[PDB]
From a paper:
Encapsulation of lipid chains within the hydrophobic pocket involves a cleft-like gating mechanism that results in two glycolipid-binding modes. To elucidate the structural dynamics of the GLTP–GSL dimer and associated adaptations, we comparatively analyzed nine novel crystal structures of wild-type GLTP (wtGLTP) and the sulfatide-specific mutants D48V and A47D/D48V complexed with N-lauroyl-containing monosulfatide (N-lauroyl-3-O-sulfo-galactosylceramide; hereafter referred to as 12:0 monoSF) and disulfatide (N-lauroyl-3,6-di-O-sulfo-galactosylceramide; hereafter referred to as 12:0 diSF) in different crystal forms and compared them with previously studied GLTP–24:1 monoSF complexes.
The GLTP mutation D48V near the ‘portal entrance’ of the glycolipid binding site has recently been shown to enhance selectivity for sulfatides (SFs) containing a long acyl chain. Compared with wtGLTP dimers, all dimers of D48V mutant are locked. Compared with the wild-type protein, some interfacial regions in the D48V dimer contain noticeably expanded intermolecular contacts. The first region involves the α2–α2′ hydrophobic core formed by residues Pro44, Ala47 and Val48 with their counterparts, as was originally found in the D48V mutant complexed with 24:1 monoSF in the sphingosine-in binding mode. The extra monomer–monomer interactions arising in the mutant and described in detail in the next section stabilize the closed conformation of D48V–SF dimers, which we therefore refer to as a ‘locked dimer’.
Numbering used by the authors:
A (entry chain A), B (entry chain A): 10 to 209
C-alpha cells in the first residue's frame, strides 16, 4: 500500500507484508539460501514479539524506535526491535537494489544469463559496509548458487509463466511503493541517530 | 534427564532442553554462526508449532513420526515436524561428535589451539552426506571463523572461568545422556523408515 501522507509506517501491516518475503528464498533453487531465509525471518519474529507486547505503544515503526530509545537508555540502539529492524532494512534494501538493477537492464555482457552482477551491486550498496572478510568470502561463494536470471524471474511470476518482459513490468510497479517505504525506514534511522556501523 | 526405561522421548521437555542450544552459537565469537543459529531455531520452532496443535497426540517424538505418517500419506517423511526433526537431529549429532572428539583428545598436532579437525570429523559424520559441493565449500570457508579451542571452552563454562580440564570433565558428563537421547532419535528414524538421503 502507498505511504500515508504523514509517512508513518503501521507496524502490523508492515509485518504482514514483510512476512511474504522469506518464502521467496525457498523458490531460488538452492538450499544455500535457507540460512538467509531463517535470519530474515528471525528479524521479523523479533519485531513481532515486541509489537505483540503492546500493539498501541508500537503502532508504527517510528514508535518502536522512539519507545525503545526511552526504554533502554545507553544500550540503545543495539537492542530490541530497533536492532532487528536495523538488520531487516538492510536485507530489504539489498532486495530493492537487486530488483531495480535487473529492471534497469544492468547485466554482464558475457554472462547475460546470470544475475551475479546485480547481486554484487546490491551487496555493495546494502550490506558490504557491515561485513568483515570471512562474511564477504561466504557471499562470494554463495553467488555460485544464485539462480539463472530466467529461473529467478520464474520464482516471481506466481507460477503463471509470463514473458520475462511481463515479469519485469510487474517488478517495476512493485518497486514504486516498496522503494518509498524502505526510504522512509532509512530516513527514520538517520533522523533518530539509530544507525550503527559495526561489522560482523 | 536420563531416558525412561521405555526410551520414549517426551516432546515438551525435549523442546525446552533443545531450545538452550541456539544461544550457544552467539557465544562463538563470530557472526558467521548467526545463520546456523537461525536454521536450528527454525527446526525447533516448526516442531513446537506442530506439538502445540495437540500436545497429547504429540506427547512423544515417536508419536510425531507415527501420527504424521498416518496424516500425510505419500508426502511423508518429507513434511511437517518429521522433516524438521530429521534436520535437527543432524545438527544435534554434529554437536555430539564435535564435543566427543574434543573430549577424546583428538587434535592436529601442528594446530593444537584450533578445533578445525574436530569440526571436520563432526561434519563428515553428521552432515556431509546430505550436502552438495557449494554447501561443502561454505562449511570449509566458515571454519576460518571457528573459535580457538580455549575460547570455545570458555563459551561453555557459564562464564565461570574454570580450567580447560574442568570444562572437559563437565562436557564428558553432559555427553552421557545427550548421546543416549540422540541415539534413540536416530533409531526411531531408522526403525520407521523415516530417514531421507537427498542432498541440499
Ligand atoms: C552452505 C549454504 C549456506 C549458507 C549461507 C549463504 C549466504 C550467506 C550470506 C552471508 C551474509 C550473512 C552472514 C551473516 C549474517 C548475520 O550475522 C548478519 C547480522 O545478523 C544480525 O546480528 C545482530 C547482532 O549483531 C542480531 O543478532 C540480529 O538478530 S536480531 O535478533 O536483532 O533480529 C541478526 O539478524 N546479518 C546480515 O548480514 C543480513 C543479511 C541480509 C541478506 C539479504 C539477502 C542476501 C541475498 C544474497 C544472495 C547471494
Ligand atoms: C557469511 C557468514 C555466514 C554463514 C554460514 C556459515 C555456516 C554455513 C554452514 C553450511 C551448512 C548449512 C547450509 C544449508 C543448510 C540447510 O539448507 C540444510 C537443510 O535445511 C532444511 O531444509 C529442509 C528442506 O530440505 C527444510 O526446509 C528444513 O526446515 S524445516 O522447516 O523442516 O525445519 C531446513 O532446516 N540444513 C543443514 O544442513 C543443517 C545444518 C546443521 C548445522 C549444525 C552446526 C554446524 C556448525 C558448523 C561449524 C563450522
Ligand atoms: C539472489 C537474491 C534473491 C532475492 C530474493 C528476492 C525475493 C523477493 C522478491 C519480491 C518481489 C515480488 C514482485 C512481485 C512480482
Ligand atoms: C563450531 C561448532 C560449535 C558447536 C556449538 C556447541 C554448542 C552446544 C554445546 C552444549 C554443551 C554444554 C555443556 C555444558 C558445560
Amino acid at each position: 500500500k502507498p505511504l500515508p501522507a504523514d509517512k508513518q509506517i503501521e507496524t502490523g501491516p508492515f509485518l504482514e507484508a514483510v512476512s511474504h518475503l522469506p518464502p521467496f528464498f525457498d523458490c531460488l533453487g538452492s538450499p544455500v539460501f535457507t540460512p538467509i531465509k531463517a535470519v530474515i525471518s528471525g528479524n521479523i519474529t523479533k519485531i513481532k514479539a515486541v509489537y505483540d507486547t503492546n500493539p498501541a505503544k508500537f503502532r508504527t515503526l517510528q514508535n518502536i524506535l522512539e519507545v525503545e530509545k526511552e526504554m533502554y537508555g545507553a544500550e540503545w540502539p543495539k537492542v530490541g526491535a530497533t536492532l532487528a529492524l536495523m538488520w531487516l532494512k538492510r536485507g530489504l534494501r539489498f532486495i530493492q537494489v537487486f530488483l531495480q538493477s535487473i529492471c534497469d537492464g544492468e547485466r554482464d555482457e558475457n554472462h547475460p544469463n546470470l544475475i551475479r552482477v546485480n547481486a554484487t551491486k546490491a551487496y555493495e550498496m546494502a550490506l558490504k559496509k557491515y561485513h568483515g572478510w570471512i562474511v564477504q568470502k561466504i557471499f562470494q561463494a554463495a553467488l555460485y548458487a544464485a539462480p539463472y536470471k530466467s529461473d529467478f524471474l520464474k520464482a516471481l511470476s506466481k507460477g503463471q509463466n509470463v514473458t520475462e518482459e511481463e515479469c519485469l513490468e510487474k517488478i517495476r510497479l512493485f518497486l514504486v511503493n516498496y522503494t518509498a517505504t524502505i526510504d522512509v525506514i532509512y530516513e527514520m534511522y538517520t533522523q533518530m541517530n539509530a544507525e550503527l556501523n559495526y561489522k560482523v
